[PDB]
């Protein structure tokens, strides 16, 4: 069995290997990359996402989110308070202000220490989940706006044509902006490209051990767990690496820098934080190997998780027994 310790693998495809996206994912899996739940892909030196980032300041962040924490430093939830619209130029200036800017630090490990010690005492503002793309239309390789759709994959594997669309999302971050522990909708893959700015630190639990994280989370968030049998779908719970280690949960960590891709694999729980002002693009995708994960994915039906239009068909075709109850949650 390849990668039996479930380590995060880093890949350096050549320009020739970067042509065929599906083939390269399957290659990474042949080497055991999926066992970690997360892989890093460094593009060939010949590749670029677009020519420059000099002209992005007028993008609108219609609903910036202030991430307010509750709990203790290593075990907390966050809620998202909606703020007034602002441009990416306005958000960048806010991120660099004395109130929000990255503190002085020695290295990524010092900054990680500072994150976990102090995150709860601040409320950073995240520009998340903005439909759009920063890839140039002429970028032919690993262009996250031109990937094969999940609807087309389901149709190719299973024979059933379904409604829905699959487009990317932009994320504008600042110091301490946080992504809570989650797997993707319907335990899909995700791919994330860090276009510009400061790094993003990731934590990940191997898919084979995801239920260990779930059991810990039920213990640590006992009210939330009574409310919903899949409350990590709400994307609000944080658990620190120190707490994970104290409870014997297998995990790994890695820092993504500008110009690098990360892929998350089906049922790979992940969480993390941004180091300073940055912009990332991400989208969900599927392969043949996803189908079995999609059929078994948990679902939130309490009403909280509320998701995209295209999840309807995935539930309806892959999980017809759950469909009625899940759809009640959506209405």
Binding site, annotated residues for 2-oxoglutarate: 126, 192, 200, 235
Rounded Cα–Cα distance for residues 263 and 284 (Å): 10
Q: With CA atoms as reference, report the closest residue to 199 among 181, 182, 177, 180.
A: 177
Give residues with Cβ within 8 angstroms of 255, minimum separation 6. 108, 199, 200, 201, 202
Residue from 91, 179, 267, 269 touching ligand OGA (CB under 6 A): that is 179
The first and second tokens of residue 61, run together, are: 């962040």
Q: With CA atoms as reference, report the closest residue to 151 among 184, 186, 182.
A: 186
- Integer angstrom CA distances of residue 134 from 168, 211, 221: 10, 36, 38
CB of residue 320 to ligand OGA, shortest distance in Å: 27
According to the binding rule CB under 5 A, does residue 16 interact with Mg ion? Answer: no
According to the binding rule CB under 5 A, does residue 228 interact with Zn ion? Answer: yes
Rounded Cα–Cα distance for residues 39 and 290 (Å): 16
Our CB check for Zn ion shows the closer of 243 and 302 to be 302
According to the binding rule CB under 6 A, does residue 190 interact with ligand OGA? Answer: yes
Task: Answer with the entry of Zn ion, Ni ion, Mg ion, none that 58 interacts with (C-beta below 5 to 8 A by kind).
Answer: Mg ion
Q: Which stretch binds Zn ion (CB under 5 A): 125-133, 139-147, 208-216, 295-303?
A: 295-303
Identify the DSSP state of 319.
-
Tell me, rounded to whole angstroms, the distance of Cα 258 from its chain centroid: 16
Residue from 236, 280, 286, 311 touching ligand OGA (CB under 6 A): that is 280
Our CB check for ligand OGA shows the closer of 142 and 171 to be 171
User: Where in 57-86 is the site for Mg ion (CB under 5 A)?
Assistant: 58-59
Helix (H, G, I), strand (E, B) or coil at 1: coil
Residue from 76, 100, 142, 171 touching ligand OGA (CB under 6 A): that is 171
CB of residue 224 to Zn ion, shortest distance in Å: 9
Residue from 11, 304, 317, 330 touching Zn ion (CB under 5 A): that is 304
DSSP letters spanning 138-159: T--SS-TTSSPPHHHHHHHHH-
Identify the DSSP state of 185.
G
According to the binding rule CB under 6 A, does residue 189 interact with ligand OGA? Answer: no
Residues that bind Mg ion (CB under 5 A): 56, 58-59
Residues that bind ligand OGA (CB under 6 A): 171, 179, 190, 192, 264, 270, 280, 282
Residues binding Zn ion (CB under 5 A): 228, 300, 302, 304
């Amino acid at each position: 069995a390849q990668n039996p310790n479930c380590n995060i693998m880093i890949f350096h495809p050549t320009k020739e290997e970067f042509n065929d996206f599906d083939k390269y994912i399957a290659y990474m899996e042949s080497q055991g990359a999926h066992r970690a739940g997360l892989a890093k892909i460094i593009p060939p030196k010949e590749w670029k996402a677009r020519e420059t980032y000099d002209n992005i300041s007028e993008i609108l962040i219609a609903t910036p989110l202030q991430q307010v924490a509750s709990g203790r430093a290593g075990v907390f939830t966050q809620y998202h308070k909606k703020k007034k619209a602002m441009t990416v130029g306005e958000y960048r200036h806010l991120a660099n202000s004395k109130k929000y800017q990255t503190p002085p630090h020695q290295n990524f490990e010092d900054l990680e220490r500072k994150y976990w010690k102090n995150r709860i005492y601040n409320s950073p503002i995240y520009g998340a989940d903005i439909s759009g793309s920063l890839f140039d239309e002429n970028t032919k390789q690993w262009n996250l706006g031109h990937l094969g759709t999940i609807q087309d994959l389901l149709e190719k594997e299973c024979g059933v044509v379904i409604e829905g669309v699959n487009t990317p999302y932009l994320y504008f971050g600042m110091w301490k902006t946080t992504f809570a522990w989650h797997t993707e909708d319907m335990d899909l893959y995700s791919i994330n490209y860090l276009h510009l700015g400061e790094p993003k630190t990731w934590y990940v639990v191997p898919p084979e051990h995801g239920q260990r994280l779930e059991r810990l989370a039920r213990e640590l968030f006992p009210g939330s767990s009574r409310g919903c049998g899949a409350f990590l779908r709400h994307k609000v719970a944080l658990i620190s690496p120190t707490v994970l280690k104290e409870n014997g949960i297998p995990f790994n960590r890695i820092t993504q820098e500008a110009g690098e891709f990360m892929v998350t694999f089906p049922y790979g729980y992940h969480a993390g934080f941004n180091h300073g002002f940055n912009c990332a693009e991400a989208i969900n995708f599927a392969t043949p190997r996803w189908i079995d994960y999609g059929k078994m994915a948990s679902q939130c039906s309490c009403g909280e998780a509320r998701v995209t239009f295209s999840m309807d068909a995935f539930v309806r075709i892959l999980q017809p027994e759950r469909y009625d109850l899940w759809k009640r949650g959506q209405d």
